[PDB]
Amino acid sequence: NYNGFDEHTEARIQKLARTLTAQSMQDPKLDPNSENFSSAAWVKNMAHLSAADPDFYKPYSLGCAWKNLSASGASADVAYQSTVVNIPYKILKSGLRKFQTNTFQILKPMDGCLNPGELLVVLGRPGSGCTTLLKSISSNTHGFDLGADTKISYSGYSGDDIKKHFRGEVVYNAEADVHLPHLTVFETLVTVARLKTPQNRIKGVDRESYANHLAEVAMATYGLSHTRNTKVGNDIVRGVSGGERKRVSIAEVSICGSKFQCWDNATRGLDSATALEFIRALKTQADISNTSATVAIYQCSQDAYDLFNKVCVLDDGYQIYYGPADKAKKYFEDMGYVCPSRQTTADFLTSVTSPSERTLNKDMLKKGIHIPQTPKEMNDYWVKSPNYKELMKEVDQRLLNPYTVSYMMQVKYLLIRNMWRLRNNIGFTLFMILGNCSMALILGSMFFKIMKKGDTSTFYFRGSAMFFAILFNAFSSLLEIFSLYEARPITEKHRTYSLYHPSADAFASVLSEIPSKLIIAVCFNIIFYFLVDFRRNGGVFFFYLLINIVAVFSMSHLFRCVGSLTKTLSEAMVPASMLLLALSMYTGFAIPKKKILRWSKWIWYINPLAYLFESLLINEFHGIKFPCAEYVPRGPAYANISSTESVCTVVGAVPGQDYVLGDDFIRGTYQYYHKDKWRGFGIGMAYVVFFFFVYLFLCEYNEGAKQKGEILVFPRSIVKRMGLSKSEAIFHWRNLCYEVQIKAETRRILNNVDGWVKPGTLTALMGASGAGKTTLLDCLAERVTMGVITGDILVNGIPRDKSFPRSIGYCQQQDLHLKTATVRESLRFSAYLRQPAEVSIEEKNRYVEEVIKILEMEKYADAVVGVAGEGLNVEQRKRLTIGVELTAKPKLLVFLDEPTSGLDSQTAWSICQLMKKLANHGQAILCTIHQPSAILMQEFDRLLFMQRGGKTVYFGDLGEGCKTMIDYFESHGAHKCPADANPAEWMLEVVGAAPGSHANQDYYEVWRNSEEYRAVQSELDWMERELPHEFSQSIIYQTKLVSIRLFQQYWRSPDYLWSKFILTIFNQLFIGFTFFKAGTSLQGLQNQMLAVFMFTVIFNPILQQYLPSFVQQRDLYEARERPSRTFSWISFIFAQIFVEVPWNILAGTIAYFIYYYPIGFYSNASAAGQLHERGALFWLFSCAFYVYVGSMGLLVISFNQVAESAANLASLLFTMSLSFCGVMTTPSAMPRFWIFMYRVSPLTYFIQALLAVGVANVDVKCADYELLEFTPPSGMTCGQYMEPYLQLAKTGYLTDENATDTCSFCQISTTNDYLANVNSFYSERWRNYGIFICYIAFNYIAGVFFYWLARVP
Ligand SMILES: CCNc1cc2oc3c/c(=[NH+]/CC)c(C)cc-3c(-c3ccccc3C(=O)OCC)c2cc1C
Ligand SMILES: Nc1ncnc2c1ncn2[C@@H]1O[C@H](COP(=O)(O)OP(=O)(O)OP(=O)(O)O)[C@@H](O)[C@H]1O
Ligand SMILES: Nc1ncnc2c1ncn2[C@@H]1O[C@H](COP(=O)(O)OP(=O)(O)O)[C@@H](O)[C@H]1O
């Protein structure tokens, strides 16, 4: 707990000062080693000496003073919802509107002043202009225009002046907790301290020592010393508590020396005590650093409100009161309103703007005095009031009258921060190193055998192995983008106040990866170059390693540039995928430099991997003579021969040689010359430097964040034009208990709890944070699974049956709804599945209308749920959550879990009024409540109060003004409740659960021996004696509804489907037109094989695009639809399959149409008289491949919790299948060990059948450079000479059978014989299609089974 400079922090800071001065040694008000030393004086001295630099003309304090302040923004006229068939027109129309308006007055003219050292609380309802005010007075007016008449003076500096120079002296913080999760608090603060040390003006203490001291003083000042070595953490990574996480942000901004601050949503997610601690830390900062801060907060506690000097009250953008906080209540009570005795002043000030909550002073109405009731009237009254006159006197007088450390020091400190990040998340990096090591091991094992012999038979495999090496080194840096994106928001924060250049952060990020990149390169290349058995000369190996280093750095920088240009990784997925495809395909192995068409030769020329692969091949092949493997004239008939009458069967061969000079081979096949060896290094370094500079430039300037108004979406079909059943049984539980084995052997969470809820009564379930409130709801609702429950939970005196979980309604704290659905659609979806089967759908529609009317959401019934930022706000989402359960016609109860938590006071009161209205209708509502205000407590009929450990302390009708509860407690020793104390908080103090932990006695035992307890027992006995199909719809109907909703999600998810289809179109079109009519040359055939190979590499991105949709569906299901018994997991998974398949089939059809024909497989099929059959079968394979990618995505996500891990697993399996599919290395060339992997991978059968269909049953046309030349023996034509050989190796054709001086030979006559070498056959095509479909079926079935295992309980 934090108490804002109690003597403990003073002693801690005195110890720190003694340590600093003693370390240096190795006026009496300030000498730590003496008496009279004052810790406040010490911190104040440091804060002054931080801003006392002779070169700095910054102020010692800033205080804003504005008048006429008015802001406005372009009206956000509600716009229709984006859908796959509508987003193109939407983009076109938006582009036209930008190519070629009304306004909304966000804030009407306001005035105010805030001297240094003061704290201002801005009070207003949501949408009242609080955030806009904080952005205006902090000069963050991006997204809206500021009035032409506004005047803002920061103690003399115009807002323009602080924007130009002193930015960071005025700081606006939307959320406090934006931190690197994996740094400890001390590291997070020491990096900031280092970046702020005035590097020229410290003597006697080393700069690291001073930075450490300043970080420790910041921690002690804000009560964080106990978290020195704790990880800062996150909502998903364990670390310091939320309050400590926000006080870390306060300490950080304190170190950075901002003199003016704003905190828009400071206390979001904090309970009363923790929010008070945060405000107290802010007050301590104001006292010490003399900063002025402004906080916009809801549910402001009276204790917290006591700390603010000034208050600002808004409603509809009008200012109603500005001035001292303690005068606000009296000012409004003079206005004509009255504060209920127990109402905290902040709630009074905020409610005075809410007509259904205010209370007009009846006396002042009898006098006929007008009491303003609408915001304009209140603002006019304030303008008239003497408070405004006095405020303007103060304002008018005040309107009458870049980085601390050099660039390289910023780089150094940010690099150290990055290394700390790595050494705290080191597990990921270790798995990362091991992944590359293992992939190198596997690939090298795959090439080990064939490469070993070294004959000319290994040329294609040398090419393929070097292609793998260059790819797996160049792209082994791409998973640093995760860290890049994670760091970007904190870089933006640290830019909002001048701490370092964003270029310094980018440069630190680049330099921090060098260790990992070098280690990966060394390990991978050492393992690979040895297994693959490239040249063992040391110099060539080191040149190879150098080229790989240049490749990895080049790609790292190129894709950092892309990452910098996108909001998230998902948005970069598409262009990054295009870049990967272009670079990998045009590296010079898939299609040699000779065969690249004129339309895309420039791609080779600008591709760095092309030049680097050139250098690698020149290095590998240059100057080495590979002994010839096999000759054309061959066999016993050719035992005796002259050397020149034979030739080696490879490109660079010359007749009569026993070897082929690898340089000749590469010159013939790729046209790389030894003179170009060092071109690769030069171009690679040129690219590396250029893209490094462009990365710095982009990170320096292209960033920002813009404000936009909350909007409702109202799908286009709407924009074209634009009775609740009573509870019937009494639910009572007796002697309830619950134990779980997790934290301790037989640990009780509930202890003999008992009670009941009757129809038409709203029951409050209260307790401290924890205390088994939600646990009691989960047990009563039979929503809990683990542990053992004991005791009675009876309905109408009878044990709850198997229909009970359906008969009740349970509104969870988290309002989770399918974002793409609409409010009306969501309610109708809930009604259809859960209401009794025999109810006609028109009646379900009418009941949904009744429910919509009751919740008074009719004005936005058609809106899209969306998300927090766009769509329904918190109140609307809560109302939708309640409606969804009301539409299930819960026969028995309605369980609510903290409906009023996370809301403001006025929205909370609105929700409580809705709950009481429902109870009046007849509903039996049991709802957990947290820190309710005394006014809300007047709504609940009964109160079940539970002490820590699930130990009931009270259960009774709290009656009027909580008098019954107060009386029960006071009669039993509790100290009298003050007439102005909140009964909820007071009772929480009586039992000792609230801080100040001590109780006059164990009140659990007082209850157990109370008279109320025996009365409850008698009533429970009478309830015991008053006693006189797991799913509603069948599985087929549930599947129908769920699949329809999932379709409506794909539709209306234009980003996903358009990314999928544009990626398909671009990738496959690029493949098809890179190999445009490749022809049937010997190289053309393997080029087409590699084209079919590249057709498959689209797998990863289109799987990763799909996974988020499944995760979005699955979260909603498992979190609300499953416990509610809305539908069975069977329907969920069948919908996931049935909806994903059709879109994959459509994408496959598009891919076929744009790939099969451009590349020319159609002409090959036509030449064979098989156009229709082969075209149809290729279309079937494309559709099957896309369906298979979908099925693999489903399989991997069926048990992986997060999408990233599922994507990684799918990528690894696809990599194995692709590597061992038998084209990068033929099956007979693999080690006998890997034949299982070759046989099992689906891509063997896919690729073999696809290539067979593409190029089977036609003739080969060997180009000039491919023909084999040799001289026929004396006195016989080549026609006669080659006949003996030609009859045994029964294929091949001489270009001239009657030549006698020399003849050219083609060793493949027809493409079928070539395909036989690749092991692909035409007669197998249909069997392969069947096998591939079997793979899809197994993927889907295994996915279903693994979802059943992993996820179903
Ligand atoms: C848009 C970028 N696309 C991708 C880039 C990737 O780069 C990777 C770089 C790596 N090096 C460290 C940074 C490591 C270890 C794995 C990587 C994977 C990967 C992860 C798991 C299994 C296989 C692979 C994989 O295929 O890796 C091929 C290099 C990976 C995956 C995708 C989709
Ligand atoms: N360009 C714009 N920028 C900001 N708000 C706008 C704009 N156009 C219209 N508005 C509307 O003006 C109102 C201003 O309220 P604002 O959000 O600033 O205060 P608030 O809602 O109390 O702040 P917070 O959202 O942090 O609680 C909002 O309802 C918003 O929808
Ligand atoms: N592993 C666990 N899983 C679920 N609940 C647990 C576990 N360990 C302890 N608990 C119990 O969960 C309770 C916290 O939930 P609860 O108090 O119902 O939430 P809330 O107070 O927000 O309604 C604690 O009382 C604690 O005894």
UniProtKB/Swiss-Prot annotation:
Give all Phosphothreonine modified positions.
Answer: T19, T21
Q: What Gene3D superfamilies does the record tag this protein with?
A: P-loop containing nucleotide triphosphate hydrolases
Membrane topology designation:
Multi-pass membrane protein
Side of membrane Extracellular, spans: 449-464, 535-537, 592-680, 1112-1142, 1201-1205, 1259-1327
Its chief place of residence is membrane
Q: Which cysteines are joined by disulfide bonds?
A: none
Briefly state the modifications made to the protein after translation: Ubiquitinylation mediates endocytosis and vacuolar degradation. Phosphorylation by casein kinase I stabilizes the protein half-life.
Where is the chain membrane-spanning?
A: 424-448, 465-485, 518-534, 538-556, 572-591, 681-699, 1089-1111, 1143-1164, 1176-1200, 1206-1230, 1240-1258, 1328-1350
Which keywords appear in this protein's UniProt record, sorted alphabetically? Antibiotic resistance, ATP-binding, Cell membrane, Cycloheximide resistance, Glycoprotein, Isopeptide bond, Membrane, Nucleotide-binding, Phosphoprotein, Repeat, Transmembrane, Transmembrane helix, Transport, Ubl conjugation
Q: How does activity depend on pH?
A: Optimum pH is 7.0.
Q: Which domain of life is it from?
A: Eukaryota
Domain ABC transporter, by residue range, is 96-341, 731-974
- What's the reported outcome of changing G767S? Inactivates drug transport
Cell location:
Cell membrane
Q: Sites of the modification Phosphoserine? A: S24
Changing G871C does what? Confers generalized drug resistance
According to its UniProt entry, the protein is used in biotechnology as follows: Strains lacking PDR5 are used for toxicity tests. Strains overexpressing PDR5 are used for screening antifungal sensitizers.
Q: Which GO terms describe its biological process?
A: intracellular monoatomic cation homeostasis; response to antibiotic; response to cycloheximide; response to xenobiotic stimulus; xenobiotic detoxification by transmembrane export across the plasma membrane
What's said on domains?
The N-terminal ABC transporter domain (positions 161 to 410) contains degenerated Walker A and B ATP-binding motifs, suggesting that it may be less efficient in ATP binding or not functional at all. This is a distinctive feature of the PDR subfamily. The unusual length of the two extracellular loops at positions 686 to 774 and 1408 to 1476 is another specific feature of the PDR subfamily which may have an important role for function.
Misc note? Present with 42000 molecules/cell in log phase SD medium in log phase SD medium. Full-sized PDR5 orthologs are found only in fungi and plants. Their topology and substrate specificity are distinct from mammalian MDR transporters.
The record's comment on protein family reads: Belongs to the ABC transporter superfamily. ABCG family. PDR (TC 3.A.1.205) subfamily.
* Identification of the protein by name: Pleiotropic ABC efflux transporter of multiple drugs
Q: Which organism is it from?
A: Saccharomyces cerevisiae (strain ATCC 204508 / S288c)
Q: Which gene carries the instructions for this protein?
A: PDR5
